[PDB]
Amino acid sequence: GLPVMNTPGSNQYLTADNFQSPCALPEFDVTPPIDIPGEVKNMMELAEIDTMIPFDLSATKKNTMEMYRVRLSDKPHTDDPILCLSLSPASDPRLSHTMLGEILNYYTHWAGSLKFTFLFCGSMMATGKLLVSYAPPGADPPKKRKEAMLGTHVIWDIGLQSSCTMVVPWISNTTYRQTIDDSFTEGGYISVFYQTRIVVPLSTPREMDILGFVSACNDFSVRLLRDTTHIEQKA
Amino acid sequence: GLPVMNTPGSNQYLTADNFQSPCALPEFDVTPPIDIPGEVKNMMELAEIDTMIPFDLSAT
Amino acid sequence: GLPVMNTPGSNQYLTADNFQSPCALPEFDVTPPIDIPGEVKNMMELAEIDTMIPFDLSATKKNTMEMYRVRLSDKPHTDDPILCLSLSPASDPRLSHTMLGEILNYYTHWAGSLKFTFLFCGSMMATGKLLVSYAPPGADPPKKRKEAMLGTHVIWDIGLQSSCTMVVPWISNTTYRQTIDDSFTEGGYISVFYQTRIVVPLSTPREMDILGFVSACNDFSVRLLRDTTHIEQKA
Amino acid sequence: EACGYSDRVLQLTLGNSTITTQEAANSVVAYGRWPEYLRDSEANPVDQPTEPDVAACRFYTLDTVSWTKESRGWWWKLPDALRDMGLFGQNMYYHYLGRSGYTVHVQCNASKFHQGALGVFAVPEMCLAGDSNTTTMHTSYQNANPGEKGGTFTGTFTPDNNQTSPARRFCPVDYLLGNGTLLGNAFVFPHQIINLRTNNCATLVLPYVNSLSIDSMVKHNNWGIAILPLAPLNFASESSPEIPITLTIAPMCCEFNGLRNITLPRLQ
Amino acid sequence: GSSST
Amino acid sequence: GSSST
Amino acid sequence: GSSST
Amino acid sequence: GAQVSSQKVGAHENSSTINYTTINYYRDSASNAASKQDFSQDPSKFTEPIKDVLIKTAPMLN
Amino acid sequence: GAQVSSQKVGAHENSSTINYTTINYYRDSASNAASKQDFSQDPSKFTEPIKDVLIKTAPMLN
Amino acid sequence: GAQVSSQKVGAHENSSTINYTTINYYRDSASNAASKQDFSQDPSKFTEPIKDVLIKTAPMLN
Amino acid sequence: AATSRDALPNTEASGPTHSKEIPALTAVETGATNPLVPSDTVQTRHVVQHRSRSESSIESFFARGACVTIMTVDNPASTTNKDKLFAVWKITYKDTVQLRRKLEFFTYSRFDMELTFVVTANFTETNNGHALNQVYQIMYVPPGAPVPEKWDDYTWQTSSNPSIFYTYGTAPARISVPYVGISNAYSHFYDGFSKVPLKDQSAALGDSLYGAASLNDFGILAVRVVNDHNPTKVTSKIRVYLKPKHIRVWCPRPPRAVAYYGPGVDYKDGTLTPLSTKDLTTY
Amino acid sequence: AATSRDALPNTEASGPTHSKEIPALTAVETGATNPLVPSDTVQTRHVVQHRSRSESSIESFFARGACVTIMTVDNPASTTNKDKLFAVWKITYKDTVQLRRKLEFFTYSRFDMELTFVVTANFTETNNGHALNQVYQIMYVPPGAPVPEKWDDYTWQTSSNPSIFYTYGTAPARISVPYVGISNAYSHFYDGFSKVPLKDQSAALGDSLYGAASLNDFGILAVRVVNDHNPTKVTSKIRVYLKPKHIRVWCPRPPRAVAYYGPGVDYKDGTLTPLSTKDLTTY
Ligand SMILES: CCOC(=O)c1ccc(OCCC2CCN(c3ccc(C)nn3)CC2)cc1
Ligand SMILES: CCOC(=O)c1ccc(OCCC2CCN(c3ccc(C)nn3)CC2)cc1
Ligand SMILES: *C(=O)CCCCCCCCCCCCC
Ligand SMILES: *C(=O)CCCCCCCCCCCCC
Ligand SMILES: *C(=O)CCCCCCCCCCCCC
Secondary structure, three states, X not given: OEEEEEOOOOOOEEOOOOOOOOEOOOOOOOOOOOOOOOEEXXXXXXXXXXXXXXXXXXXXOOOOHHHHOEEEEOXXXXXXXXXXXXXXXXXXXXXXXXXXXXXXXXXXXXXXXEEEEEEEOOOOOOEOEEEEEEEOOOOOOOOOHHHHHOOEEEEEEOOOXXXXXXXXXXXXOOOOEEOOOOHHHOOOEEEEEEOXXXXXXXXXXXXXXXXXXXXXXXXXXXXXXXXXXXXXXXX | OEEXXXXXXXXXXXXXXXXXXXXXXXXXXXXXXXXXXXXXXXXXXHHOOOOOOOOOOOOO | OOOEEEOOOOOOOXXXXXXXXXXXXXXXXXXXXXXXXXXXXXXXXXXXXXXXXXXXXXXXXXXXXXXXXXXXXXXXXXXXXXXXXXXXXXOOOOOOOOHHHHHHOXXXXXXXXXXXXXXEOOOOOOEOEEEEEEXXXXXXXXOOHHHHHOOEEEEEEOOOOOEEEEEEOOOOOOOOEXXXXXXXXXXXXXXXXXXXXXXXXXXXXXXXXXXXXXXXXXXXXXXXXXXXXXXXXXX | OOXXXXXXXXXXXXXXXXXXXXXXXXXXXXXXXXXXXXXXXXOOOOOOOEOOHHHOOOOEEOOOEEEEOOOOOEEEEEOHHHOOOHHHHHHHHHEEEEEEEEEEEEEOOOOOOEEEEEEEEEEEXXXXXXXXXXXXXXXXXXXXXXXXXXXXXXXXXXXXXXXOOXXXXXXXXXXXXXXXXXXXXXXXXXXXXXXXXXXXXXXXXXXXXXXXXXXXXXXXXXXXXXXXXEEEEEEOOOOOOEEEEEEEEEEEEEEEEEEOOXXXXXXX | OXXXX | XXXXX | XXXXX | OEEEEEOOOXXXXXXXXXXXXXXXXXXXXXXXXXXOOOOOXXXXXXXXXXXXXXXXXXXXXX | OEEEEXXXXXXOOOOOOOEEEEOOOOOOHHHOOOOOOOEOOOOHHHHXXXXXXXXXXXXXXX | OEEEEEOOOXXXXXXXXXXXXXXXXXXXXXXXXXXXXXXXXOOHHHHOOOOOOOOOOOOOOO | OOEOOXXXXXXXOEOOOOXXXXXXXXXXXXXXXXXXXXXXXXXXXXXXXXXXXXXXXXHHHHOOOEEEEEEEEEEOOOOOOOOOOOEEEEOOOOOOOHHHHHHOOEEEEEEEEEEEEEEEEEEOOOOOOOOOOOEXXXXXXXXXXXXXXXXXXXXXXXXXXXXXXXXXXXXXXXXXXXXXXOOOOEEOOOOEOOOOOEOOOOHHHHOOOOOOOXXXXXXXXXXXXXXXXXXXXXXXXXXXXXXXXXXXXXXXXXXXXXXXXXXXXXXXXXXXXXXXXXXXXXX | OOEOOOEOOOEXXXXXXXXXXXXXXXXXXXXXXXXXXXXXXXXXXXXXXXOEOHHHEHHHHHOOOEEEEEEEEEEXXXXXXXOOOOEEEEOOOOOOOHHHHHHOOEEEEEEEEEEEEEEEEEEOOOOOOOOOOOEEEEEEEOEOEOOOOOOOOHHHHOOOOOEEEEEOOOOOEEEXXXXXXXXXXXXXXXXXXXXXXXXXXXXXHHOOOOOOOOOOOOOEXXXXXXXXXXOOOEEXXXXXXXXXXXXXXXXXXXXXXXXXXXXXXXXXXXXXXOOOOEOOOOO
């Protein structure tokens, strides 16, 4: 028959290969598709949906509903942080298990811009101005409003539009960051502060919660598919 | 000869496969068909014929 | 299926082969190239750059900065050689580790013309005429100006143009020489002499150095890729 | 609009029922799909369908529940919550097959001095976790289907130890959405948030969702409504406040196939 | 050549 | 023949 | 078809 | 001599007729694979073998 | 019946579209390899499922 | 989609360009063999990186 | 017309702002995610984007052969008192956790399936005999068909069931399967029962499992060594790899956050606390 | 438009000279190399050149599969007290010296990579038992993914990691890899650190290795024998060959002249004197 010569790779099984193979059920009458609502074409569509952040993973709030609530109060102005967070979307404990964090844990490399939205769940009679910050990597992580102020920030005024969005812009040296903690591809620091203070009247609750959400911007992508550490099977 | 690379599935025997194979009797003079009455094209033709139901399957 | 017949060579692995193979990472988002300065297309580009020759590999000058310096002096005229060198670009100890010598040690055969440039690093008040020679193989290697003079040579006059270039022209019986010492493909002899003498005035240093450089001409090529002896790994 | 129209002020009318709201936060249409009747190209049972229109596709108000600082969350299943609701229920039980879409309107008002935020989630195929650590997939039909009454979420998984007479019920832990997944990601499901400073209600329009064009409504729930306190109820300084949550649901574009005698389920 | 169907 | 893309 | 070079 | 035919495509990718190609390598028809391009017929010779054609809305016996 | 399609060429040699060829050998679509010529859609049904279209520069609530 | 290119024929038989044919079987460029149809460049950026262009017959320094 | 491998949108240059337009302020109560890009809240330069979402397409995410089961078979000495072990496996993606978790990001799915079989064997006893090369039969028994009771009974004839005859040492076996569901899509979750408990009927008769639809969903794979009993015993394992090709998915779901406990959504006590300690103001 | 396999320039005939043009005289201080051909300094004949630089093109120089590592695995008796050895290799071209030296002629590079795997096995003990044919699993574990701790733990399921299942005795395994760098080119040298030591922060926290960028640059290859424990132990080795195909390189560097000492440019005392004795006036 035709003279052939077997190359290396012959008879191997690459789990990522893409070949034709014989069908075990020939002429099978396939059931047709119907138009089910909610079709997804790409995993990044899911990363673009806002998901709630477990901001308070303290020993008594973690793995309870409390982990989602960041408590604020009408106390006098301070320049100390409400919350501090490393921009490590797949590895930081607060971001790693959000829908974005989860999809990122099936990939080795991420790139693009992120956006954080905060929701004020206090009473209508409560007012306040907060400062939401993003400091790119390389300096001392901000522990006081004065340093946070010097980087990318939004001053949120609380009022009828309940929520505020800060966009963390893609600012990296490398074209893609890793989905693990690594100093060479570190993303930087998110922190929130009181710009003035929360002010309530009398007969009003002096403490309230804010909720935080993260999602990806349209310029966000991921690559090099991999297995997650967020599920396993001992035995 | 031509560079080839064997894929998975090589040398297996799938009983439902559909391949060409060498003929053991080359140039054999085949007897032609005649027009026999009653040809069937599909098993569902048979399912469309009425058959009697064994309704009373009592022990006796 | 299609009648095939396996030829010899089937299932072997030739390290120099050129075949297609399955990709382990399908649809991977590749990072694009940027325009980095300094792209190289061919190893011979590197052999065309001047590199400094370790002319003096004497037991006390070798593997020190001194090996690069050829010392001259204002002494009376002699017909004896300043330096003597075999044209064996990959195997002679003085040429074999220069960039040209190194690239040649990854190949079995070389061909083409070479050029030697000498730089006078003496004072401006120092003058002199030197003779740079090339004798093709087959006779007594020149040990006196009178024999060197009879072959390919340049008489260099020292002055504002600090450096002089002698081109060693491709003169061989074979189409390609070997990158090892071999009498059948021997290249010949380079030697330098004083044509007159170095003359200085008073208050001027009576001894100075010259530096030598080698590079390949545009008609130079190499073939039959091979492993070098200039790097190794015991254990 | 220039002559007064707003995203906060809505009026919904279905059949002989009308809902008004002066403090809404728009409306959600799940997966961008409005309910529709089954098309001939996707049809499967060949018999002429029953389509009750205004008699079934109208607003049914279920029993009002109460939100307090102890409240961990509430859940309902559709069509189950509407099974005893007027002619929708009768039509459901007289036919083998049925399909329906829904308008869900969750109601919760308080005052400019209260705080709290309710997550209102509509989950397609909301399978919940049972109370056992020795056996799996064992929640009885009766416990799985609470009717209008609904069920609640717990903050703690507490396993049924009675092996001789098993409780056979769900044990839906709230931060795990009662199904083994983290609540913070439940926002990929169609939802609205009743944040008391912003809105008195949530309105979700739900299409029929299934892997089939039509199915047994008695054997199978298509949607689950999950309401959880994302931010706990708070008022002035009262240590124990309360505000009502009223759930009103309307079937939409519901059709039924396979008419025979009425199904009488064992619900106790 | 190619018999199409 | 060849269906191009 | 055949891309020649 | 290449034979090109259409596939009935059931489950489609998120990715226009799809075809497949066939070449017979052997001179004897017996060696050939099964085409599966088969024809259907109407069951009448088994289901209605009566001499006078039946009209389903009319009385079978008249 | 040969299908000819474009490669998205990432790292180029120091060496104009590059193509690859595909032929389906089997009658059943299930037997076919994955094309990977897939389409993208806009996330709106998940990200913006609201009845009244939102304008990002305007107040979300009015 | 077959690519046809010329061989540089060194030792000829006692036997007009000779060609060879190439077909890419895979969608990813990485899977492809090396073309070896490479380009050469002039060494100037390494050999003559000076700002004022040099004329070899003229004095290098003036 | 947007391809998965198309480049994502370019960043446009954006300057300072003093306006009544408020992109940063929104209301998530509506159910919507705020569609903001960096040029809405910060000054940006022009970037020509080259990145693509090609590898996160549904095909690309699932285009890998995943292990769904390990079947054990053997071929003992004729003289042994134990029966020759043939394997029976109820087909599913739920016996292992990794591919199950990826498919469960979605409620429903349609796909063609590629099954690849890796077969390895070894000697059991410190014995010194031999075995000649083994041939294995992998028979699919669809629900209704006679399940084998003995390694060598009539069912292994396979006149109608699909069988693969695999020769040891050759390239791993592979077949494709069409979309075989009796629904328009595979249900990854089924909030329901397969029976209705009827008042008139006894409790026992109306009972069924929560979340379970067709009791025998898709049948079983039965595997055996076709070789006769050999004096030296050889044990063999068949690892099954599943790849969903030509896949479509509907209705997204949050991923499994706690360990899987059985075929349903149930969780076991003690496996419910996945998140680590980290303080609110600690980077 | 100049091809690598194009012939080099012809030598032109050149006659005697008595001129003010001075090609031989130059000044290397400028940084330039004098572009002279033989007809500038000697009388030449006309030669029609036929030689080519085809084989010294960057592709041609690197178009060879080079050994970058030897991985050892085994499959012991079930009864042994030592664990079955599976191999873990941190992927790099720097564990062997030859290809490393060739790539280090340049500062930066882009290439697709072809990996070829040669697998050999042998018996360890003067025993007389046997082993049936072994199948090997070569799994790529990218940084972030669970690294295997046992030859048979859940990670070997590979639902998303790329794996090769190799059968002993068949043609050597081979795969291609795209350009996978997070930079626009692979850096053969990185004059820097991955961390900044900050005054305010403790010395220990700011410290990192000189020349090292991403701690886990590209992940690991994990290899195992899929076959179960056999009474007779077999040891196997996997030799990995790397070929850079479709390669581009930037910024030339002098070759390594002294022996390599570790992953960086460091040299060890005693290996620093490569050049031999040869006298200035000795041919
Ligand atoms: C409800 C949960 O499970 C699933 O949805 C799900 C599980 C398994 C899936 O595979 C479909 C079932 C079968 C189809 C036929 N099949 C075959 C067919 C022939 C042969 C030789 N071997 N195997 C093997 C698998 C498809 C979907
Ligand atoms: C900084 C020094 O090292 C390098 O620059 C350098 C070193 C190694 C290089 O290879 C890239 C890394 C990996 C990429 C993926 N890879 C794979 C992928 C899949 C499989 C099955 N096996 N191996 C193996 C190698 C490329 C560059
Ligand atoms: C009609 O068949 C003309 C085109 C043929 C194309 C080449 C077919 C592939 C090789 C088949 C060889 C002959 C097999 C006996
Ligand atoms: C369209 O396909 C016409 C051209 C076919 C060229 C020959 C294809 C190679 C041989 C395939 C044989 C058939 C495989 C079942
Ligand atoms: C362009 O390629 C059209 C002509 C193709 C001729 C047949 C090619 C040989 C078979 C290749 C099959 C596909 C390989 C994935």
